[PDB]
């Protein structure tokens, strides 16, 4: 009866400003935040413009807690995870969701 409240597929507006990116197995996920509406958008960008980039690699070598970045103060992921659940996260492509989902599955571990 309620129906579709809003369309999941939405265009990447120019209002959004790049805040940070995450690199995993050579595959980069650029996280941008729409300041005007206070929403979040994702794109395939790996430019050195970012002033906040963190790397994550194979869990078996357990690099996350070793030589690589040991800063767990990245509360941005907690807010991003909440945005997905609450629904303030959307993008113009369905393909990136399936590929991105693989990283989300690993975060479920801890």
Structural notes for this entry:
- By secondary structure, the protein is of the alpha+beta class.
- The chain has one domain (17-107).
- The chain contains 2 helices and 4 strands; from the N terminus they run ββββαα.
- The protein has helices at 76-86, 95-107, and strands spanning 17-24, 27-34, 39-43, 53-56.
- It has a 4-stranded mixed β-sheet, with no helix packed on it.
- A hairpin with a 2-residue loop joins strand 1 and strand 2.
- The radius of gyration is 15 Å and the shape is globular.
- It starts with 16 loop residues before the first strand and ends with a helix.
- 6% of the residues are buried.
- Residues 11-110 are annotated as: DNA-binding.
- This is DNA packaging protein.
- Belongs to the phi29likevirus gp16 family.
- Homopentamer. Interacts with the packaging RNA (pRNA). Part of a DNA-gp3-gp16 complex.
Walk me through the topology.
Elements: E1 17-24, E2 27-34, E3 39-43, E4 53-56, H1 76-86, H2 95-107
Parallel strand pairs: 1-4
Antiparallel strand pairs: 1-2, 2-3
Summarize the structure.
The protein is an alpha+beta fold and 110 residues long. The protein contains 2 helices and 4 strands.
Residue share in β-strands: 15-25%
Extended strand count:
4
Largest sheet data? 4 strands, mixed
Q: Please state the structural category.
A: alpha+beta
Radius of gyration: 15 Å
Number of helices: 2
Q: Return the string of H and E elements.
A: EEEEHH
Helix content class? 10-25%
- In the sheet with the most strands, the strands line up as 3-2-1-4
* Shape verdict: globular
**Domain unit count:** 1
Compute the separation of the termini in Å. Answer: 38 Å
